[PDB]
Every structure is written in C-alpha cells, then in structure tokens.
C-alpha cells in the first residue's frame, strides 16, 4: 500500500529498491516471516549479504547497521525495517 519512509541512511537507489521489494513481498505473502524473507533475499542478491529484515504491525528494535544501509518505512499500516549488518 502507500509507502512512507520515516528514517533512512541509505542511497536513493537502495531506498527505492527497499520499497519496491517490500511492496512485492507484501503483495505476494501474507505471513510476516515470509514477507521479511523475500525482502532480505532480494537485497543479498543485488547488494550483497548480509541483510536482515523485520516486517510487522507491532514491534520495536535496537540494532547496529552498516553506514548507508538502513531504512525504516511503512506500507500502509505495516512497518518494514531493512538494513545491512555483516
């Protein structure tokens, strides 16, 4: 649904891929673990490992990320955290 970016330390190209990848994942999958898995795998392929993704309606996180590889955004009411670490 509508993409709203709250935080990002990430290039413009990777930001757009984050939304696009999450958009496809959310359309294709219903289960959060599978939505997250789709998003992560796509980034590992195009932008190299090691990416991590959490997708959900209710969570907080405190993580460490690689510089220029962090975004936090919503698609409708669903929050997506997408970053590299390792």
């Amino acid at each position: 649904r509508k993409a709203v970016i709250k935080n990002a330390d990430m290039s413009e190209e990777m930001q757009q891929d984050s939304v696009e990848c999450a958009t496809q994942a959310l359309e294709k999958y219903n289960i959060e673990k599978d939505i997250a898995a789709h998003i992560k795998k796509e980034f590992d392929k195009k932008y190299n490992p090691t990416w991590h993704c959490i997708v959900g309606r209710n969570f907080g996180s405190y993580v460490t990320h690689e510089t220029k590889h962090f975004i936090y955004f919503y698609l409708g009411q669903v929050a997506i955290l997408l970053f590299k670490s390792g």
Binding site: N7, N58, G60, S61, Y62, T64, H65, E66, T67, F70
Partner: protein
Amino acid sequence: KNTKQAYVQCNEDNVERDIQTEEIETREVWTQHPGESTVVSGGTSDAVVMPK
C-alpha cells in the same frame, strides 16, 4: 568498520485525549390548575395599583 546504532518504534506516538460533555441546567417549578392568580412560583413598591 564504519557502523552505526539505531532503533525503531512502530508506535511512534500515542496521543491521549480527555473529553467532557457539558452539564444540563434544570429547575423545579410548581403548577396547579385550580388556584390564585399566580399559579406557581419558583422554590413592596406596589406601583401595580397606581394605574387604576
């Protein structure tokens, strides 16, 4: 390595509101069909006679 710490909170804000309706003003009143000229009243200049 060049890494950074960050965090996210889904519940980014939780706005609280108080709501109160107004009160209703009521009064007690008398009435009676059979009676004196002044039917009911709520619970000495006499300039009233002068015109006549």
